[PDB]
Amino acid sequence: SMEQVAMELRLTELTRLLRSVLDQLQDKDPARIFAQPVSLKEVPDYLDHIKHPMDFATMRKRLEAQGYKNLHEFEEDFDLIIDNCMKYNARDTVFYRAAVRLRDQGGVVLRQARREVDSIG
């Protein structure tokens, strides 16, 4: 149907916007602490601590399969990245501080992206 196509054009446009949002967010991680999943080789206990791991690469795979239906879904994943790190790592570590900074800087990008997704529909 033409209705199905139109919905698909809307998913495609959201995916275009979310990709630019992802690059902006990722630029707030110059150190690349959040670029890839935490290694179960190097942190064998990770899954006993963190039930839902997330990283930017895994967000990118999902994005390119157009697996984010809305911005809420994309934000949930971004927040897991931050939130997982602030749980597993202690306050005085470089990892915890890098999540605090990504959260703060990312919150600005997302404040406007929420207006763009509403605005453009």
Side-chain angles (χ1 to χ4, degrees), residues 1-2 4-6 8 11-15 17-40 42-60 62-68 70-110 112-119 121:
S1 86
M2 196 61 216
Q4 284 298 316
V5 164
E8 288 166 353
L11 180 51
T12 298
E13 280 309 282
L14 172 72
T15 300
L17 193 150
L18 294 176
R19 190 175 304 123
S20 159
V21 170
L22 189 51
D23 296 344
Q24 290 180 68
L25 294 175
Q26 182 141 48
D27 296 330
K28 313 314 161 132
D29 178 34
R32 294 186 80 79
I33 290 149
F34 307 110
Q36 300 299 317
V38 173
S39 176
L40 300 187
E42 294 143 10
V43 191
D45 87 329
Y46 192 55
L47 299 185
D48 304 326
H49 296 270
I50 300 296
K51 297 303 152 184
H52 300 103
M54 196 37 62
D55 58 277
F56 286 131
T58 303
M59 290 192 57
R60 215 178 282 284
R62 189 174 163 180
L63 188 61
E64 299 309 313
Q66 305 192 335
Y68 297 111
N70 58 49
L71 181 65
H72 184 73
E73 291 192 341
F74 179 98
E75 283 182 349
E76 282 192 350
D77 274 354
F78 178 70
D79 287 332
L80 272 172
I81 292 165
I82 295 310
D83 290 341
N84 287 353
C85 184
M86 299 166 72
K87 288 173 189 78
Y88 187 86
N89 306 108
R91 206 143 53 240
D92 75 307
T93 64
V94 64
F95 307 102
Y96 187 111
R97 287 158 184 284
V100 165
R101 294 161 59 83
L102 176 58
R103 189 196 59 186
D104 287 350
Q105 295 192 285
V108 176
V109 167
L110 295 171
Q112 190 58 40
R114 156 60 45 209
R115 304 187 65 84
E116 288 171 304
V117 154
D118 281 6
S119 186

